Design a protein around this ligand. Sequence first.
Ligand SMILES: CC1=C(C(=O)OCCN(Cc2ccccc2)c2ccccc2)[C@@H](c2cccc([N+](=O)[O-])c2)C(P2(=O)OCC(C)(C)CO2)=C(C)N1
Ligand SMILES: O=P(O)(O)OC[C@H](O)CO
Ligand SMILES: O=P(O)(O)OC[C@H](O)CO
Ligand SMILES: O=P(O)(O)OC[C@H](O)CO
Ligand SMILES: O=P(O)(O)OC[C@H](O)CO
Ligand SMILES: [Ca+2]
Ligand SMILES: [Ca+2]
Lengths: 263, 263, 261, 263
Amino acid sequence: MYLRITNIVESSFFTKFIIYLIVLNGITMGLETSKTFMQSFGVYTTLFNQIVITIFTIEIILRIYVHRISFFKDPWSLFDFFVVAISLVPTSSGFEILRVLRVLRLFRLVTAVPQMRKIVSALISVIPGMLSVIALMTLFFYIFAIMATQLFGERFPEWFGTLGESFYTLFQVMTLDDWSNGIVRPLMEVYPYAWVFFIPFIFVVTFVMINLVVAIIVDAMAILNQKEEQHIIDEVQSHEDNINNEIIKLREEIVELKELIKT
Amino acid sequence: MYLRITNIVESSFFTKFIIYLIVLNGITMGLETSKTFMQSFGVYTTLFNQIVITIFTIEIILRIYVHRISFFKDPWSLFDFFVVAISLVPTSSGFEILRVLRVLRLFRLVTAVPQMRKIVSALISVIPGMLSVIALMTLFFYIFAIMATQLFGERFPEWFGTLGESFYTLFQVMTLDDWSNGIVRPLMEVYPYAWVFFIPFIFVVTFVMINLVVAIIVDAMAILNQKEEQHIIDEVQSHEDNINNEIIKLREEIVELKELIKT
Amino acid sequence: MYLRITNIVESSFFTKFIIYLIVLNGITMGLETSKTFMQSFGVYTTLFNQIVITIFTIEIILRIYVHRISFFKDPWSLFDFFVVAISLVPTSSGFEILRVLRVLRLFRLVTAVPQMRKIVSALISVIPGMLSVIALMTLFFYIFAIMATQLFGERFPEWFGTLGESFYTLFQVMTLDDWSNGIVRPLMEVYPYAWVFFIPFIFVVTFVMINLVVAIIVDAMAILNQKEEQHIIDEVQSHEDNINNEIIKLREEIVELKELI
Amino acid sequence: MYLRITNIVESSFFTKFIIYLIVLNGITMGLETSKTFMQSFGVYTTLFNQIVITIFTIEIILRIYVHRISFFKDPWSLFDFFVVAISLVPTSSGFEILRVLRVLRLFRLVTAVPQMRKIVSALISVIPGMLSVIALMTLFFYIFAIMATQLFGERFPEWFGTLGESFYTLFQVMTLDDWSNGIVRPLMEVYPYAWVFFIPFIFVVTFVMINLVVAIIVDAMAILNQKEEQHIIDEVQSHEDNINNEIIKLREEIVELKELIKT
Ligand SMILES: CC1=C(C(=O)OCCN(Cc2ccccc2)c2ccccc2)[C@@H](c2cccc([N+](=O)[O-])c2)C(P2(=O)OCC(C)(C)CO2)=C(C)N1
Ligand SMILES: O=P(O)(O)OC[C@H](O)CO
Ligand SMILES: O=P(O)(O)OC[C@H](O)CO
Ligand SMILES: O=P(O)(O)OC[C@H](O)CO
Ligand SMILES: O=P(O)(O)OC[C@H](O)CO
Ligand SMILES: [Ca+2]
Ligand SMILES: [Ca+2]
């Protein structure tokens, strides 16, 4: 029976039908936004929602028997899995956050549609090279968050009270969000020199972001000229000393013609 | 009189003419902006408008004969068609919003000037390949919109009472416009963890844009290496398939001295 | 024998002296900020400005005499000229707002030095390639100013009442400055769909500013690849043509042992 | 005795120990941020600072011994040194920024981890290039800062009262941080034409930042594209001086078959 289900999971009808259920379920996810619509139709869509989660788990289990292990070595399939698992947690209780994370299920449309995975893939690819810089930055934030909390916390607690208080505030400053009328000018009333802290924080952070981008584009170029030079260097050494194997059978031949002297 | 009017339409004069009207009428739409002006000279401009609109209509008509079905397959003409059609909906009456849409007819200066035509064309060219990602972002927005609305709308209706509402705010946050003192910190007095929503949102949004920009730059400079490489790659073969061919000649010239075979 | 003075205007010391001046006067421009200073040393320093300003006048005259018409085809000169002419107009005058422009004479430091000049010159060079887009965009503003004025100027005259008013505001919205909480959201409390005007506006202008940067970088690299292959090909071709010079005299003296028999 | 110490100092145990010490010390410094923690465990903390501060003074000395004057011509070491100094000075004194500047010793984790000082390097490496542009802009600011102080400082003393205050506001404007509603929009009430100063300032300032990027990127690439030229032209160079070097012997195996006229 294994091959019998495998023909299904792999059909064009399967993926389209699941893509189809993703999409319209998405539309219902959106209609539950309206409190008006939720009245005249609430039980309809929650029903619908239960049908979709059913079909999805059906599907996901099928996919597992058809792919087992390979399935769990697949980033994309793990996603659908966890994102479906979440939806499978009951419409209940105090930790009511999960009712809302059920709208993550719509990200299946990203898994289900190949054009889109490529985009997500292309995006993630940039990340691992950056993990070093991310560390350095987070270190830099940490160190400055500490100083903030200490230098500024007592008189300005909404902003620099806790450690995490200052983290949030320093993120805002980085996005240059209302940074000067909004935070530093207040600070400077008590502590006139605050700028000696915030002006450098701004230049370093902005500096790094910008440059990091420059480096990315330019280093990527550097490897493109690499493969190109290779490809062309590979040519002058494919030719030339293949025109060497022919200018020495001039040589072998030229000296094959050297008992002109015997006569 | 097909050929007689084709001659007029296609002439340099006609085009220079329509352009000149476009400039005057655009100068006068700026003057129509002054309440002070209309009281003194406003009689003059409601007919100037009413006859430039008339002249333009005539033109659009002519041009249609002169190109028939091919006129309605030209982007630039189709524009002129609509942008002048909208200016025909009554001098008053209908709705007064189509009287504001009237001023759009100055974009006919972009349409009727071929430096502008291509400059716009240049700009539009990067879009159709972007389309996929525009969809991915839109889905991202929309999921988050659904999410923000049922997390912050009951308590913060101004910002999150509706999908549309939350679509707006999330756009605001994307442009980083007064996002933290302006939306999130208030949200956070009622909901201390709002940062776990919006900071992830900010990264994704921002990360996608920037990398999108890198990709365009970085991929375009790839294609340029392609055509340069094969330009160069072809030209070594032209001057190195030339070499080994006239050493084949020399190799043979040596085997011309087979005439040692005379003995 | 005017040439005498010509050798002095051109001298290393003529230029180096004027730069000492431009820097000095520039250090006094700053201290004329401290009203603390400008009582205790006001007279002391107003002369310094009077000396400097006459010297520069002299300098400009000499440069003129030396370079004649060719002086007025030189922007760097033309600038020096106007920025000094400006400073000439007395003070009190008709309006203490040309007294302010006087400061602009410090940019003479950009003039007096290369490197500085190269860089200014460097930056400007992208501009002429841009005159077209700058115009399309200006048309784009103009059009949306006219539209914004007449759509919102009635109830929002501070932001959109006058044509120039709408220009200023659309400029602010372009820099995304307090655009939503400070402008559109207020607008929408009277005119709900006003987002249909501002979101597209922001998209258009943002898109244009980014692409233009992308076009500059990539079209730059294309010109850089034109030059590259032509240096590589003009190499490959020429040597490859090096190789056929040693082939024809390894050829037509393989014809003398052939003519041998 | 040198080489015995030298081999300890260069040990990866030495390095890893100091790195470890750097890291746990960083963990305690965030703990000092809590007022709860400092109550219940603050004495545990303040001695560990002493410990680490000693150990590092030891570490720095062992290293000066090992490297002699080579140590003092090393930026990363100079830093490690200068940062340990600050942490040395007795707690309090009259000004207690030093009891805060002490959290800079965490930056040692940068100098200590070889992968981090690499990216700081790459970053720093861009600066020398732009020291001229910097000067240009620093002047430009100065000039505009003088100009605004004496145009808006009497009536707007907070923003423009002194030179210093004008530098701060112009920097605020440069970052485009709340510029219009805030500074510029108020100013224009008193001085209507103030847009004539803050639009130019903004164009110039943002143009120059933005182009400056373009110049790095594109000139970086011009250099990249040239090292490619050499590598390619070098192979060509090689073949056509080095095979005429070894068929110059084939150039004289043809005069031998000539020369055999003689008797
Ligand atoms: C929505 C948005 C931004 C924005 O509107 O902030 C104003 C930027 N700015 C002048 C400026 C920038 C830096 C230091 C000093 C001054 C600007 C904006 C519009 C027109 C002209 C200039 C800024 C930005 C600023 C700060 C933080 C972040 N973040 O974490 O995503 C983004 C950037 P960026 O990479 O910034 C750099 C330039 C050359 C402008 C290109 O884009 C993007 C990608 N996102
Ligand atoms: O007015 P509502 O409550 O029906 O919701 C309006 C939304 O924009 C449509 O879903
Ligand atoms: O305090 P003042 O009056 O001496 O002026 C301070 C300025 O920042 C010095 O140039
Ligand atoms: O009435 P105004 O002030 O908009 O005048 C029109 C000009 O374009 C700007 O002054
Ligand atoms: O305020 P505390 O003492 O509970 O600590 C909160 C900080 O973010 C944790 O160090
Ligand atoms: Ca802002
Ligand atoms: Ca703001």
